[PDB]
């Protein structure tokens, strides 16, 4: 599953670098651009909607691996409610980045990569055909061009 692998590489690297605060495959030229667009818009979403992120994180009260595992139910539910668009995908991944920052903070960084997997599973498995139509991460980068 190439679309899956690439999405996980992107989502994993963004989450990892955001938590660690230090930068780290196929279709890599696209992935570097996707990762570049993500740092830019993903960071914007996290700053401008920080109170909502803090509130959601707090309510979630993630303390361990079973709390991360529990995240997927809320994730699939609320992420699937609105109409499919890249802005919703950025909210999904961005909040993931937020959670990744929290995990590292509380010494649960080993849960980060699995978290990126939960996220990539929701994104790709529920929006697979839409992504295909949008030409994957090329559509992503295209949509946010500045
Ligand atoms: C009222 C408004 C929210 C409605 S809306 O239709 O505009 N909502 C969305 O578009 C949306 C899409 C994906 C989302 C979320 C929301 N949220 C909740 C958000 C984060 C601040 C509150 C986090 C969720 C998520 C992502 C990673 C991990 Cl690890 C866990 C979770 Cl629960 O992903």
Curated annotation (Swiss-Prot):
One of its GO terms (cellular component) is nucleus. Cleaved by CASP3 during apoptosis. Treatment with taxol or okadaic acid induces phosphorylation on additional sites. GO terms for biological process: cell fate determination; cellular homeostasis; DNA damage response; extrinsic apoptotic signaling pathway in absence of ligand; intrinsic apoptotic signaling pathway in response to DNA damage; mitochondrial fusion; negative regulation of anoikis; negative regulation of apoptotic process. The keyword Secreted does not apply. It comes from the Eukaryota. There is a cross-link at residue 23 (Glycyl lysine isopeptide (Lys-Gly) (interchain with G-Cter in ubiquitin)). A motif (BH3) lies at residues 34-48. A motif (BH1) lies at residues 77-97. It is found in: Membrane; Cytoplasm; Mitochondrion; Nucleus, Nucleoplasm. Its main location: membrane. Induction: Expression increases early during phorbol ester-induced differentiation along the monocyte/macrophage pathway in myeloid leukemia cell line ML-1. Rapidly up-regulated by CSF2 in ML-1 cells. Up-regulated by heat shock-induced differentiation. Expression increases early during retinoic acid-induced differentiation. GO terms for molecular function: BH3 domain binding; channel activity; protein heterodimerization activity; protein transmembrane transporter activity. Changing residue 33 to R: No effect on ubiquitination. Keywords: Apoptosis, Cytoplasm, Developmental protein, Differentiation, Isopeptide bond, Membrane, Mitochondrion, Nucleus, Phosphoprotein, Transmembrane, Transmembrane helix, Ubl conjugation. A motif (BH2) lies at residues 129-144. Interacts with HIF3A (via C-terminus domain). Interacts with BAD, BOK, BIK and BMF. Interacts with PMAIP1. Interacts with BBC3. Isoform 1 interacts with BAX, BAK1 and TPT1. Heterodimer of isoform 1 and isoform 2. Homodimers of isoform 1 or isoform 2 are not detected. Isoform 2 does not interact with pro-apoptotic BCL2-related proteins. Interacts with RTL10/BOP. Interacts with BCL2L11; may sequester BCL2L11 to prevent its pro-apoptotic activity. Interacts with GIMAP5 and HSPA8/HSC70; the interaction between HSPA8 and MCL1 is impaired in the absence of GIMAP5. Involved in the regulation of apoptosis versus cell survival, and in the maintenance of viability but not of proliferation. Mediates its effects by interactions with a number of other regulators of apoptosis. Isoform 1 inhibits apoptosis. Isoform 2 promotes apoptosis. Belongs to the Bcl-2 family. This is Induced myeloid leukemia cell differentiation protein Mcl-1. It comes from Homo sapiens. The lineage of its organism: Eukaryota, Metazoa, Chordata, Craniata, Vertebrata. The gene is MCL1. The chain holds residues 172 to 321 of 350 of the full protein.
